[PDB]
Design a protein around this ligand. Structure first.
Ligand SMILES: *[C@@H]1O[C@H](CO[C@@H]2O[C@@H](C)[C@@H](O)[C@@H](O)[C@@H]2O)[C@@H](O[C@@H]2O[C@H](CO)[C@@H](O[C@@H]3O[C@H](CO[C@H]4O[C@H](CO)[C@@H](O)[C@H](O)[C@@H]4O)[C@@H](O)[C@H](O[C@H]4O[C@H](CO)[C@@H](O)[C@H](O)[C@@H]4O)[C@@H]3O)[C@H](O)[C@H]2NC(C)=O)[C@H](O)[C@H]1NC(C)=O
Ligand SMILES: *[C@@H]1O[C@H](CO[C@@H]2O[C@@H](C)[C@@H](O)[C@@H](O)[C@@H]2O)[C@@H](O)[C@H](O)[C@H]1NC(C)=O
Ligand SMILES: *[C@@H]1O[C@H](CO[C@@H]2O[C@@H](C)[C@@H](O)[C@@H](O)[C@@H]2O)[C@@H](O)[C@H](O)[C@H]1NC(C)=O
Ligand SMILES: *[C@@H]1O[C@H](CO)[C@@H](O)[C@H](O)[C@H]1NC(C)=O
Ligand SMILES: *[C@@H]1O[C@H](CO)[C@@H](O)[C@H](O)[C@H]1NC(C)=O
Ligand SMILES: *[C@@H]1O[C@H](CO)[C@@H](O)[C@H](O)[C@H]1NC(C)=O
Ligand SMILES: [Ca+2]
Ligand SMILES: [Ca+2]
Lengths: 208, 208
């Protein structure tokens, strides 16, 4: 296991315009050079091959508008829900219960969450969602807990970005920051998701 | 540590001992020894097998009886997550050639998950980790799609003190039949021991 597939050597960054040392090949779209070393992030990225079996320029040519710096990632249709045999998205509106733990790689202006602990490859995100923008949130990784019930679009994640997808995504009608200000989510600190028991479910009632 | 700290002393209170391979001697509570190597240990890293409950509390919540004759009670609608109208969220979907799937259970069943899904995303009871054939420790099987076929595809409801919210694939033929008819092949451990073997080379890029 390594950064680039062996095929990409001896010049794995050929075709890529360097911009800044922090990122693979200097391209922010390729994500950070250094990756998480601690639980749970290392657990969530343990199965993540950043480019699949592709090389950097091949990856951008497949998934973005241009290999050059002006290129932007192209996203799946239908908000990225897995499509059924009639090419309709699979989802339903569902109430998230108080106590449920969610997480997200990305800014709090987004509307896509996952269940706490979902592998990165289940989220069908590009490498740049691992870029750090706030030092207090390395890798742009945020964990939340539902404090008041609310309804989201809930459904399977389509494969994209050379990953299998098939986690569950929650698509909110208010962005994360707005949900926090309105009392629907609260932020969790590392000490609240560092133990196995903190990943279990005490809020769903049993059948008896 | 097999049990929540609150369960000491006498964490097996109320449990009839049957066989020393299982927690409290009870096969419903799963095996004493959990996976030590990759990928299985990665899938169980966030797994607290009783949540915050003690063994008898767990069986009282999720089974018909704490006594040996009690059996686990399963969620309605095949365990698909329910929407605000109490209807299961799923659709018929075609699984593409190349997709990798896994399963804790015998090949006579019909429930698969995407390769690498955490155990807690599957909403399975502890007994699905019991070994029945030495060739398949923890009853863990990995498959790859060799001919496309349609399955019921949808999010997994929380159950058994876990959050669920993986994706499940409910087949119309049992796994054994899908293998015999050429839709699935069995994977050797050597075919899912590297990160790149979890990526997705089969889904095509967007048309540009
Ligand atoms: C996913 O696809 C399912 C079908 O998939 C195919 O089949 C499976 C087994 C795989 O092989 C797969 O690969 C295939 O692609 C689909 O299942 C279908 O669902 C429909 C709708 O629910 C079912 O039709 C209903 O059947 C019942 C039973 O019909 C039999 O018995 C009656 C009573 O004796 C006879 O009169 C019939 O002729 C049949 O012999 C009917 O009662 C029912 O009628 C209802 O709807 C009509 C009008 O639509 C009303 O007038 C009635 O009053 C009823 O309200 C439907 O006809 C169909 O049987 C079923 N197929 C199979 C093979 O089971 C499933 O719905 C799909 N799921 C999703 C989420 O899309
Ligand atoms: C995107 O940019 C392309 C040109 O970029 C070229 O290559 C980079 C690495 C720099 O050397 C730059 O100076 C070069 O001109 C265009 O060919 C392409 O049309 C641009 N995309 C759009 C939509 O205009
Ligand atoms: C899901 O729900 C949408 C409408 O829900 C209502 O409006 C949104 C903006 C939220 O305020 C929500 O809480 C309200 O109940 C529909 O537009 C959409 O079609 C629904 N989708 C499905 C599959 O039911
Ligand atoms: C590249 O961008 C990061 C983002 O903060 C910055 O910390 C770093 O210093 C930049 N590289 C250089 C050489 O300035
Ligand atoms: C316990 O279970 C194992 C596995 O099913 C079996 O081989 C063994 O005979 C059982 N009894 C004892 C006493 O180990
Ligand atoms: C299980 O065994 C107990 C002990 O006799 C009995 O009371 C109970 O009815 C049996 N069946 C179930 C489903 O609990
Ligand atoms: Ca803690
Ligand atoms: Ca291998």
């Amino acid at each position: 296991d390594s950064l680039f597939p062996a095929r990409c050597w001896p010049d794995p960054c050929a075709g890529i315009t360097f911009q800044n040392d922090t990122y693979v090949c200097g391209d922010p779209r390729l994500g950070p050079v250094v990756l998480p070393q601690k639980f749970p992030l290392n657990n969530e990225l343990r199965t993540y091959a950043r480019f699949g079996a592709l090389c950097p320029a091949e990856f951008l040519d497949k998934w973005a508008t241009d290999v050059a710096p002006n290129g932007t990632y192209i996203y799946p249709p239908a908000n990225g829900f897995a499509l059924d045999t009639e090419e309709q998205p699979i989802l339903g509106n569902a109430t998230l219960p108080v106590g449920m733990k969610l997480d997200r790689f990305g800014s709090e202006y987004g509307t896509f969450l996952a269940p706490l602990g979902a592998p990165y490859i289940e989220r069908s995100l590009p490498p740049s969602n691992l870029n750090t923008f706030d030092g207090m949130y390395p890798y742009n990784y945020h964990v939340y807990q539902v404090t008041k019930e609310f309804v989201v679009g809930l459904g399977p994640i389509a494969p994209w970005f050379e990953q299998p997808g098939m986690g569950t995504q929650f698509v909110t009608y208010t962005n994360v920051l707005g949900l926090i200000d309105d009392g629907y989510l609260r932020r969790l600190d590392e000490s609240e998701y560092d133990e196995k028991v903190e990943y279990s479910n005490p809020y769903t009632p049993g059948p008896n």
